[PDB]
Design a protein around this ligand. Structure first.
Ligand SMILES: CCc1c(C)nc2c(C#N)c[nH]n2c1=O
Ligand SMILES: [Cl-]
Ligand SMILES: [Cl-]
Ligand SMILES: [Cl-]
Ligand SMILES: [Cl-]
Ligand code: NI
Ligand SMILES: [Zn+2]
Length: 338
C-alpha cells in the first residue's frame, strides 16, 4: 500500500519487463503511484537503440534559452528562442566551460549547486521535438506505441488525442529546468533517458498535490490571479528548502541513462538536468486515470491548451456512471491510494 508515499524503484527480469501494461498494473498493485513518480530499470540486456552516433546529425529546430528570475528558492522562468542547431553543436556548447556541469562531490552537492546558481548563466535546452529514436522493431516499452486507453479510443472510436500520445525528445544541458507541473489532463507520462548525464526529479504525492497548489498560490499571487491553473504554464520553480520549510511532503530521485521514469496522474514533479543528455517522453492513460481527467483543473487563460473531451472514456469504461456524469451528478472525491 506504500503509505509512506516514497518513490519506488523497480528492477524487472526480462520475463517481467516484456509486457509494459501488465508491469504497470503490478507497480500500482505495490502502491507505486502513491509517490507520484516511480523508476524502472530495464534488464541490462535490453537496448532500444544499438548505436546513437547518428543522433548527432539531428537538427534542434528551436533551442530555448531559459531565463530564471527570483530568489530565496522561488523563481519564475521565461524563454528566449535561439536559432536552430544540430545535436552535435548543442553537445559541444553544453560541454564548453560556460555551460558544463560544475565539479561536485555527490548528487546532493550538485543539487545544492543547482539551486545556488540558477540566476547566473542562462542554460539552453531543446524540447517538444516530435519523434522517437528507438530502433525499428523494438517491441518492449516502445514509447511510440504503448497501447493504452488513449490509443484505444483514438483507433476504435475516432477520438482526437491532440498529439499527447506521440513521442517527444528533450535535449538537456547542465542546469536546464523542468518547472513544477502535472501532465496535461493529469495524464501519466513515461520518460526514458537514452544517453548522457543524469536527470534529477522531485515529486509530490498526488494525495498532497493540493498543498503544492496552495503554497504556489500564496507565493505567486499575481500568477494565480491570472490563471486558476497557472502551474500548467510550466514556469514556476520552488526549491526543496521551501517545501521543507512549509512541510509539503516530497521525495527526490536521480534518473541515470538507460532508466525509465513514470509519472502518475496528478503527480506534481519538477527537476533539472545534470549535463548534456537526451530523453524521450510521452503521455498515456489507464482506466484509473479517467476519474482524474474528469476533475482536472484546466488552464483558463490561453485558448490552445491541450483539452481532451472525457465523454468517450466515461461512456466506454464507466457505463454505470455515464448518465449521472452528464447530469452533473457524478460527484466524488478521488482516493489517490486506490
Ligand atoms: C529542460 C527540458 C525538459 C522539459 C521541458 N521537461 C522535462 C521533463 C518532464 N516532465 C523531464 N525532463 N524534462 C526536460 O529535460
Ligand atoms: Cl566548477
Ligand atoms: Cl554552476
Ligand atoms: Cl495551478
Ligand atoms: Cl511528454
Ligand atoms: Ni512532466
Ligand atoms: Zn493558464
Amino acid at each position: 500500500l506504500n503509505p509512506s508515499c516514497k518513490i519506488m524503484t523497480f528492477r524487472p527480469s526480462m520475463e517481467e519487463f516484456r509486457e509494459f501494461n501488465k508491469y504497470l498494473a503490478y507497480m500500482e498493485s505495490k502502491g507505486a503511484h502513491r509517490a507520484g513518480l516511480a523508476k524502472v530499470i530495464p534488464p541490462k540486456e535490453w537496448k532500444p537503440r544499438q548505436c546513437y552516433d547518428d543522433i548527432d546529425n539531428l537538427l534542434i529546430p528551436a533551442p530555448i534559452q531559459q531565463m530564471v528570475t527570483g530568489q530565496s528558492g522561488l523563481f519564475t522562468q521565461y524563454n528566449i528562442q535561439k536559432k536552430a542547431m544540430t545535436v552535435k553543436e548543442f553537445r559541444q556548447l553544453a560541454n564548453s566551460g560556460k555551460y558544463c556541469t560544475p565539479r561536485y562531490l555527490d548528487y546532493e552537492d550538485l543539487e545544492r549547486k543547482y539551486w545556488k546558481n540558477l540566476t547566473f548563466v542562462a542554460p539552453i535546452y531543446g524540447a517538444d521535438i516530435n519523434g522517437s529514436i528507438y530502433d525499428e522493431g523494438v517491441d518492449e516499452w516502445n514509447i511510440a506505441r504503448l497501447n493504452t486507453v488513449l490509443d484505444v479510443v483514438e483507433e476504435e472510436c475516432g477520438i482526437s488525442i491532440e498529439g499527447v500520445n506521440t513521442p517527444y525528445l528533450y535535449f538537456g544541458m547542465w542546469k536546464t529546468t523542468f518547472a513544477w507541473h502535472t501532465e496535461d489532463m493529469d495524464l501519466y507520462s513515461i520518460n526514458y533517458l537514452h544517453f548522457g548525464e543524469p536527470k534529477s526529479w522531485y515529486a509530490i504525492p498526488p494525495e498532497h498535490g493540493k498543498r503544492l497548489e496552495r503554497l504556489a498560490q500564496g507565493f505567486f499571487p499575481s500568477s494565480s490571479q491570472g490563471c486558476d491553473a497557472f502551474l500548467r504554464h510550466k514556469m514556476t520553480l520552488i526549491s526543496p528548502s521551501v517545501l521543507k520549510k512549509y512541510g509539503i511532503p516530497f521525495d527526490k530521485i536521480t534518473q541515470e541513462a538507460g532508466e525509465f521514469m513514470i509519472t502518475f496522474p496528478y503527480g506534481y514533479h519538477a527537476g533539472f538536468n545534470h549535463g548534456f543528455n537526451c530523453a524521450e517522453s510521452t503521455n498515456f492513460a489507464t482506466v484509473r486515470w479517467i476519474d482524474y481527467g474528469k476533475v482536472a483543473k484546466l488552464c483558463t487563460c490561453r485558448k490552445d491548451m491541450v483539452k481532451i473531451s472525457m465523454d468517450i472514456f466515461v461512456r466506454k469504461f464507466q457505463p454505470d456512471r455515464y448518465q449521472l456524469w452528464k447530469q452533473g451528478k457524478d460527484i466524488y472525491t478521488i482516493d489517490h491510494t486506490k
